[PDB]
Design a protein around this ligand. Structure first.
Ligand SMILES: FC(F)(F)Oc1cccc(-n2nnc3ccc(NCC4CCNCC4)nc32)c1
Length: 274
């Protein structure tokens, strides 16, 4: 079979709502890869490629964003099996997700959080550009290429095609979901994304997410548990405005005073990762 011969399976890296993910190598050129299995019965959202073939939405979305270079994990190949689909994905090495990174480091220095957050913004802009809404932005779905200091977005399994009309479905992470989802089961793509970016930024500079319960999300009152500059607090509170239309655009986020003078990825690595 074209799967078992082209790739050499290694250790299981993780398992969960996303399926089972294995470390692996492409046998030809020894490129490191990740091998992700999803059972068909466990798949909720289906999509279709330009031709007839019906695939997981995730494959559709990944092909739309996997063109060229970016802060998005590249889809190298996919295979269909009788009861599952198998995805072949890029694997940086060495690598660590941002969740684990924050677990080990605690709250991030603002200089480091600025660099990370900037790269997340460019990746998300890229997705929206390609007509893709990720819908599950959070520290676990962000990989750090430790050598290069480059961040990479992963797991489009809760994603959707970007549209200008309302969304009434959501299967991403609840504590990163906006108050309009909690209260009305309605949200629009960009402003729901910006809310989750606000959660992420708080997570980075405080070492934990700001809200646990539905009622806290709805109240939208932000308490800073760690020392954070006034400019950073302001950006966070702006992303977390209760009224969707009160939140910044990607452009306003990147023109914010706190976002100025970002480090390059490589110097971020030299100063903070090496
Ligand atoms: F971490 C590795 F790079 F080694 O693993 C990869 C490499 C490339 C892609 C992925 N992906 N892509 N979608 C994923 C969904 C879940 C997932 N789970 C294992 C990770 C382990 C640590 N980081 C968060 C989850 N990995 C995924 C995982």
């Amino acid at each position: 079979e074209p799967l078992e011969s082209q790739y050499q399976v290694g250790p299981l890296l993780g398992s969960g709502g996303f399926g089972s993910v294995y470390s692996g190598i492409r046998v030809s050129d020894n490129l490191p890869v990740a091998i992700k299995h999803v059972e068909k019965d466990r798949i909720s959202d289906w999509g279709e490629l330009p031709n007839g073939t019906r695939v997981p939405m995730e494959v559709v979305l990944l092909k739309k964003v996997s063109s060229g270079f970016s802060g998005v994990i590249r889809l190298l190949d996919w295979f269909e099996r009788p009861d599952s689909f198998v995805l072949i994905l890029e694997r940086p090495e060495p690598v660590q997700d941002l969740f684990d990174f924050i677990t080990e480091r605690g709250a991030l220095q603002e200089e480091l959080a600025r660099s990370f957050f900037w790269q997340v913004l460019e990746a998300v802009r890229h997705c929206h550009n390609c007509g893709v809404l990720h819908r599950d932005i959070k520290d676990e779905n962000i990989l750090i290429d430790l050598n290069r200091g480059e961040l990479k977005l992963i797991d489009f399994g809760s994603g959707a095609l970007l549209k200008d009309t309302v969304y009434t479905d959501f299967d991403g992470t609840r504590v990163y979901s906006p108050p309009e989802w909690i209260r009305y089961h309605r949200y629009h793509g960009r402003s729901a994304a910006v809310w989750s970016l606000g959660i992420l930024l708080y997570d980075m500079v405080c070492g934990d997410i700001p809200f646990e319960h539905d009622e806290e999300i709805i109240r939208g009152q932000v308490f800073f548990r760690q020392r954070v500059s006034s400019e950073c607090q302001h950006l966070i509170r702006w992303c977390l405005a209760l009224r969707p239309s009160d939140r910044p655009t990607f452009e306003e986020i990147q023109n914010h005073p706190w976002m100025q003078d970002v480090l390059l990825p490589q110097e971020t690595a030299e100063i903070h990762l090496h």
